[PDB]
Design a protein around this ligand. Structure first.
Ligand SMILES: CC(=O)SCCNC(=O)CCNC(=O)[C@H](O)C(C)(C)COP(=O)(O)OP(=O)(O)OC[C@H]1O[C@@H](n2cnc3c(N)ncnc32)[C@H](O)[C@@H]1OP(=O)(O)O
Ligand SMILES: CC(=O)SCCNC(=O)CCNC(=O)[C@H](O)C(C)(C)COP(=O)(O)OP(=O)(O)OC[C@H]1O[C@@H](n2cnc3c(N)ncnc32)[C@H](O)[C@@H]1OP(=O)(O)O
Ligand SMILES: CC(=O)SCCNC(=O)CCNC(=O)[C@H](O)C(C)(C)COP(=O)(O)OP(=O)(O)OC[C@H]1O[C@@H](n2cnc3c(N)ncnc32)[C@H](O)[C@@H]1OP(=O)(O)O
Ligand code: NA
Lengths: 206, 205, 206
């Protein structure tokens, strides 16, 4: 396998992902790509901008991960990287628990203390953030983000690019569409149509 | 100890429990009893129905009742107990259980779940995914604490009650038996038997 | 390094703390101090009252931790202990994940399943309780208490002695003043001024 990992995005998310990869203990060097930050971030060198991806980095030397919180931009850069033949390893924190029967698409990231249970399917570039849990038989579509401490009950579906906020939760058998935003603390007790922004207990359109 | 485990209930919960048991790495074979499905589920073989409870020797198989429903898990559990089966407490490797916690047979403590000092759990309790039960809590028989629910210190939950996903409780609160707390329920005062509550704070529906 | 630890406070909180230190497996003896409880708790001997701290105990023999939930009294006893020359080890439960870039002040306690992400700063005597998570670049001022299952998003500030209740949460870039009490389930989606007490979804003054 590649001995080097390039983490795209040196923001706060980038710092956690870089530390995630560092915790795995398998890489020989971990670096940042960032269009603005220069020098080194939290010990990790920034070697250049997102342009090194197209112009200088070899898919036979570098694994790539996209540490950008914005779902649409993460999709943008992830699809880009994949089209240039880079590997986008599913990154799972040593202190996460991921079921052996779970299927998780490339570029996804599973954070410290997060859990993905049996039969769950995660498409590409999903984020299951700090201590978030995706229970049994859930479907998380491309570039979904489950924020810290959110809990999905069994058979929860979340649509493409949707964003489930810190401390949110869902009842079992609930369905959330694409481009949805559930706020921090949202208690999702019924299906949520595409594009909507909901919050409160129970979760209702803001 | 027994080398084989039979998990009763091959639903979604039963899949998680079977994976929990496999994560333990201490059984030679883990199998499903299911009244419906046939063949294998998630790589685990279904070998018959709850009727094999008959064919099955308590000297060969441990038993666990992976049924979500508190009433039904109660029925099957007592059944297997009466038939003289060992119903081991199944604690996920990635769960943290206090050494001073007391946990009844048949109970299942899922991944990332925490049970703190001096907590008492009766028979057949489910503490689900990342649910936490803090110091000196009392969970009576066949309580189900759902994913990511958090009980503060000195919380009591009555027999067969069901606390929903991501619910929480203030310390020194008490929940009656047969209660249903919905997801996200913020329990800041006592709950009487049979009541179904919800919301922030938890009020009857 | 000291081979004995004294746990001040023998209530529920102290039981959890002494078990935490026991789980570390590095002390040869762990004892309680309490002004009321006598004998032995959970196998841990209560060897005296807090008076032993100023009277009998040697800083060359005993580390000190202040397992008092109440922020103001924890502050009081900790400062007392530090003034007397005692070491106040940061106690991190083996099943907690604490970032290597995080900074945590003496007398702080990080419980099982708790997580503190990158660049987070914690001042003296913080408690991050069971399964509570403090994400990236959060600032927790001295003697803050994050109750079980509370999830703080990135760049959350918590002022001195404030108390975030069980299962509470914050959206990112949220600031909370000193002496605040956010109760169980409080969904903090805006700043919160000093001394205030809030709860609800969203958190409002009661
Ligand atoms: C590592 C990490 O931290 S990942 C970070 C992920 N963090 C999150 O989950 C962010 C979640 N975002 C939120 O909750 C946001 O408040 C949003 C997106 C739902 C709302 O965005 P905005 O509309 O800009 O928030 P704004 O401050 O305008 O709030 C508008 C109103 O909705 C209410 N509201 C806002 N957020 C919430 C919420 N999560 N729950 C309930 N009510 C809310 C506010 O109280 C306000 O009500 P008012 O009319 O009484 O004043
Ligand atoms: C791994 C696993 O899957 S574990 C699975 C365990 N999952 C759970 O925790 C399930 C929890 N179940 C719930 O929370 C359910 O919503 C229940 C049991 C509380 C309600 O069940 P039902 O009676 O079918 O709910 P129903 O859809 O009729 O809701 C009726 C009203 O109550 C409200 N409501 C329902 N559940 C909740 C809740 N958890 N919090 C707040 N309000 C709620 C609804 O918004 C609705 O309000 P309206 O009258 O304004 O439309
Ligand atoms: C190891 C451990 O377990 S650490 C334990 C940590 N535990 C906690 O986090 C406790 C957090 N504290 C709370 O949430 C408390 O409820 C407090 C401090 C907010 C309440 O303070 P008190 O002054 O005692 O409130 P009290 O319960 O008397 O007030 C009841 C009223 O306030 C409301 N209320 C109180 N607490 C809450 C809450 N957490 N969320 C929503 N509403 C609340 C109730 O709706 C009720 O209103 P109503 O009867 O007029 O409809
Ligand atoms: Na949680």
């Amino acid at each position: 396998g590649n001995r080097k990992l390039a983490v795209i995005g040196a923001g706060g998310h980038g710092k956690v992902v870089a530390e995630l990869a560092a915790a795995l203990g398998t890489y020989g060097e971990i670096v940042f790509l960032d269009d603005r930050t220069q020098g080194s971030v939290n010990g990790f060198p920034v070697i250049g901008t997102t342009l090194l991806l197209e112009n200088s980095l070899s898919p036979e030397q570098f694994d790539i991960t996209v540490a950008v919180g914005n779902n649409r931009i993460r999709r943008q850069i992830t699809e880009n990287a994949a089209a240039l033949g880079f590997k986008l390893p599913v990154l799972i924190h040593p202190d996460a628990t991921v079921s052996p029967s779970a299927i998780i698409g490339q570029g996804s990231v599973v954070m410290a203390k997060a859990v993905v249970q049996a039969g769950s399917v995660l498409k590409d570039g999903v984020i299951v953030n700090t201590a978030a849990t995706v229970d049994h038989d859930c479907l998380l579509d491309a570039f979904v983000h489950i924020s810290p401490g959110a809990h999905l009950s069994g058979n929860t579906r979340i649509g493409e690019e949707s964003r489930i906020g810190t401390g949110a939760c869902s009842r079992q058998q609930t369905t959330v569409g694409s481009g949805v935003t559930a706020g921090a603390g949202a208690v999702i007790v019924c299906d949520i149509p595409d594009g909507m922004t909901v919050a409160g207990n129970p979760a209702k359109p803001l």
